[PDB]
Design a protein around this ligand. Structure first.
Ligand SMILES: c1cc(-c2ccnc3ccc(-c4cnc5[nH]ncc5c4)cc23)ccn1
Length: 837
């Protein structure tokens, strides 16, 4: 042993994976070593040319709505070379390699103005880019040039079951330097032996006056035998006053299958939040509450009656958040071999396991050894995800879920990457099948790797609870992604580190000339001999930002003073001259927004399977650090509030016809207008459903935007989530566009209802998928929204356990609730947010 290298990694990671200042064992270093094999295996087995060109493809059928967009078996592609330019007809079913020969009669077709290649043996209609142009009504322009040298992607060269005694732990005492100014209070230590949120046993100390030092010197003996402890069980240590104030966790079985042994001084965390599960200890040793404990062995590795079958089937059919009674679990377990025949029973069945009994666990492994129907079943992501949530601590169970994820194609790993990374928070151990899966899939595909880096880095920078685990995973990735990516990552971070500083300096300073002048001045200096001459857009990797357009850069008139930034595209082969627009904002935990936007993408894909295209606009958004990150500026967009602020202003005097007026104005040909009107109808219904199902529908119209072409979309998800009546936003102005007012109707309004109904019942067809992603989303991403009531909102919103007919009438009623309310809620939002009442 690389020093200037481990230094670079550290800077890329934002955390030093060699720092053992905050550990009580070697699990992290052990994980560092373990991840060497998965990394090397994958780097050794990846195609250099495929890896360098990263074809973005899918094997899904071309949506019905995209088929119609095609005339005959014909698709035109415009090819560019030096100065020449010739369009070429194509069949949606032929490879790019064939199209190439149809052009002449070693170059590769790269998209103009993007790092995106149409390569490989896939039909041209199956490249995500081609599907994007078709949908948008944009034309496919490619440049013909030489393939990227794979040389650039070079990687730098390098017995428990015999101890029948009851488990015990001695609580020595707790220590905190300065305690709250709240005299006096009383405290006790609660110690829980946990396994997948199942409390196997629980003991508390006696009450003791809450002083800066509290000594008990008491042994807590549990009802559980040491030989019954399950791998992955936690000693959960909590301090209560008299309310929960502090918590810390310690793994009972360690990463080498060894019973935890000895003296511990654990710095605790201060108060279904996933943070509560971490086995990491507080880094702040000088302020944090401390607990002292002492411990004291290696862990080895007839026909159903009809009424019962019905009962079992009714159990298996309930939603993932439906509670199991003791009776349900006993039925499940008793009939485990029959349950094993239904992949959908698996989560509930493995919830029926008494993990605190060695003999039960042994039988459960006997179950898992009889896994043929599971391995033969078609991938069901919703079902798999349920095995990776907070209810399962057994790694054999969680491993069969990851095994199913193995068959995902790149495009689908992208769809689910954010929440897969978040699900690492539910892993008992730092080294897990899931972590290695993410690592492997990131090293296999540059597009996946890019988002993995940023998803990980985002958590490493604002989560003390998990930064250590995540940082170890990011390092393994950075050691195999290759030089070219390393550099691009380095550039991006340098750029963002500079833009971040500028944002803060500006905030410290209506936007007066002084703050405007400072912004432009600061941006001038950076651009002058300070900022890299090109960097990839973290939310749109194929895109490369060039130089700032300081003329268009401005400080937005918001209370957190977001930077509105403009860039030219560095790629000269870029047709248009449109700038690349990035909002740069401090003050919000944009991770929440990220999660809402990711769900939006999942809802669209769901709709796609039903050949439906509600027209959501899930803009790019990346959390880069502590309460900071970037947001994609959508072109040609104004806020619904501003649209109406024109005709009026100060007074909350909303007018009904204004929105429609604005759409007519913004359409050159009267034909474009009717399309915009239709686009409005679909994106409106899409947002009413999506927003209703997520519970974020009641918005002030300043947080709802619209495109010149009629694409409605919600923004500012952080604000509502952070401060969390009408079921969604469908106001007189929206209704007017569809051609209705009061006790009336319209073709477009009939259309609206219909679409909502379709969209909605379609989401219900994936109820389980939606419920598990929603549940996880709250637990790992919105701490302030992790109460029992919070997690369960979506059960009601999806009207779980209802006919499509009952469900349909339910949503229609919701549409009618909006009608009856008119501008009433908007008026209220205005009073509050615009002035303050
Ligand atoms: C000015 C501009 C915009 C805007 C225009 C175009 N595209 C956009 C994309 C995203 C956002 C947006 C979304 N969520 C946000 N949270 N905080 C700022 C923030 C900004 C905003 C935009 C929205 C409101 N006022």
């Amino acid at each position: 042993m690389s020093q200037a290298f481990q230094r670079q990694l550290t800077a890329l990671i934002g955390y030093d994976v060699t720092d053992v200042s905050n550990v009580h064992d070697d699990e992290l270093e052990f994980t560092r070593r373990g991840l060497v094999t998965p990394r090397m295996a994958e780097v050794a087995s990846r195609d250099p040319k495929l890896y360098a060109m990263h074809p973005w493809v899918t094997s899904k059928p071309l949506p019905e709505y995209l088929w119609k967009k095609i005339a005959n078996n014909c698709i035109f592609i415009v090819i560019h070379r030096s100065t020449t330019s010739q369009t070429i007809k194509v069949s949606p079913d032929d490879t790019p390699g064939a199209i190439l020969q149809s052009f002449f009669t070693d170059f590769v077709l790269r998209v103009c103005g993007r790092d995106e290649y149409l390569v490989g043996e896939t039909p041209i209609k199956n490249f995500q880019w081609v599907r994007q142009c078709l949908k948008n009504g944009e034309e496919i322009h490619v440049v013909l040039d030489t393939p990227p040298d794979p040389a650039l992607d070079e990687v730098r060269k390098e017995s428990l079951w015999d101890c029948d005694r009851k488990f015990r732990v001695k609580i020595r005492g707790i220590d905190i330097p300065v305690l709250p100014r709240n005299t006096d209070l009383t405290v006790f230590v609660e110690a829980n032996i946990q396994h997948g949120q199942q409390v196997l046993c629980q003991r508390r100390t006696s009450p003791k006056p809450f002083t800066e030092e509290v000594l008990w010197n008491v042994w807590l003996e549990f009802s559980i035998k040491i030989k019954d402890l399950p791998k992955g069980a936690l000693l959960n240590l909590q301090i209560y006053c008299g309310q929960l104030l502090y918590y810390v966790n310690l793994l009972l079985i360690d990463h080498r299958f060894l019973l935890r042994r000895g003296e511990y001084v654990l710095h605790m965390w201060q108060i279904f939040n996933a943070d509560k599960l971490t086995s990491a200890t507080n880094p702040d040793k000088e302020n944090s509450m401390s607990i002292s404990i002492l411990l004291d062995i290696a862990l080895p590795k007839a026909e159903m009656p009809n009424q019962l079958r019905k009962q079992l089937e009714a159990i298996i059919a309930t939603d993932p958040l439906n509670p199991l009674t003791a009776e349900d679990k006993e039925l499940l377990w008793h009939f485990r071999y029959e349950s094993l025949k239904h992949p959908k029973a698996y989560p509930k069945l493995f919830s029926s396991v008494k993990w605190g009994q060695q003999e039960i666990v042994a039988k459960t492994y006997q179950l898992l050894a009889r896994r043929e129907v599971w391995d033969q079943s078609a991938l069901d992501v919703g079902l798999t995800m349920q095995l990776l949530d907070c209810n399962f601590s057994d790694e054999n169970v969680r491993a069969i879920a990851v095994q199913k994820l193995e068959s995902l194609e790149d495009d689908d790993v992208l769809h689910y990457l954010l929440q897969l990374v978040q699900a690492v928070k539910f892993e008992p151990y730092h080294d897990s099948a899931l972590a290695r899966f993410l690592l492997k899939r990131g090293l296999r595909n540059k597009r996946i790797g890019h988002f993995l880096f940023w998803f990980l880095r985002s958590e490493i920078a604002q989560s003390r609870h998990y930064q250590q685990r995540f940082a170890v995973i990011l390092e393994a990735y950075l050691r195999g992604c290759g030089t070219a990516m390393l550099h691009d990552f380095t550039q991006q971070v340098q750029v963002i580190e500079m833009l971040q500083k500028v944002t803060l300096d500006i905030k410290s300073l209506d936007v007066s000339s002084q703050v405007i002048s400072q912004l432009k001045q600061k941006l001038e200096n950076l651009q002058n001999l300070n900022l890299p001459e090109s960097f990839r857009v973290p939310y749109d990797p194929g895109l490369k930002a060039g130089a700032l357009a300081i003329e268009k850069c401005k400080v937005m008139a918001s209370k957190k003073k977001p930077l509105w930034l403009e860039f030219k595209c560095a790629d000269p082969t870029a047709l248009s001259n449109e700038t690349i627009g990035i909002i740069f904002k401090h003050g919000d935990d944009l991770r929440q927004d990220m999660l809402i936007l990711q769900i939006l993408r999942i809802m669209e894909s769901i709709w796609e399977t039903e050949s439906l295209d509600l027209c959501l606009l899930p803009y790019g958004c990346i959390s880069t650090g502590d309460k900071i990150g970037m947001i994609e500026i959508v072109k040609d967009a104004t806020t619904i509030a501003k649209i109406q602020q024109s005709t009026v202003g100060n007074t909350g005097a909303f007018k009904d016809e204004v929105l429609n007026h604005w759409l007519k104005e913004k359409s050159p040909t009267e034909e474009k207008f009717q399309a915009a009107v239709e686009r409005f109808v679909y994106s409106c219904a899409g947002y009413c459903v999506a927003t209703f199902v997520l519970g974020i529908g009641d918005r002030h119209n300043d947080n709802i935007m619209i495109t010149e072409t009629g694409n409605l979309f919600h923004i500012d998800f952080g604000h509502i989530l952070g401060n969390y009546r009408v079921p969604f936003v469908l106001t007189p102005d929206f209704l007017f566009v569809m051609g209705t007012s009061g006790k009336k109707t319209s073709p477009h309004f009939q259309k609206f209802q219909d679409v909502c109904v379709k969209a909605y019942l379609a989401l219900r067809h994936h109820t389980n998928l939606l419920i598990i992603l929603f549940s996880m989303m709250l637990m790992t991403g919105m701490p302030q929204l992790t109460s029992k009531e919070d997690i369960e909102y979506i059960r009601d919103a999806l009207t779980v356990g209802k006919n499509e007919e009952d469900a349909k009438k339910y949503f229609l009623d919701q549409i009618e609730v909006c009608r009856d309310k008119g501008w009433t809620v908007q008026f209220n939002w205005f009073l509050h947010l615009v002035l303050g009442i």
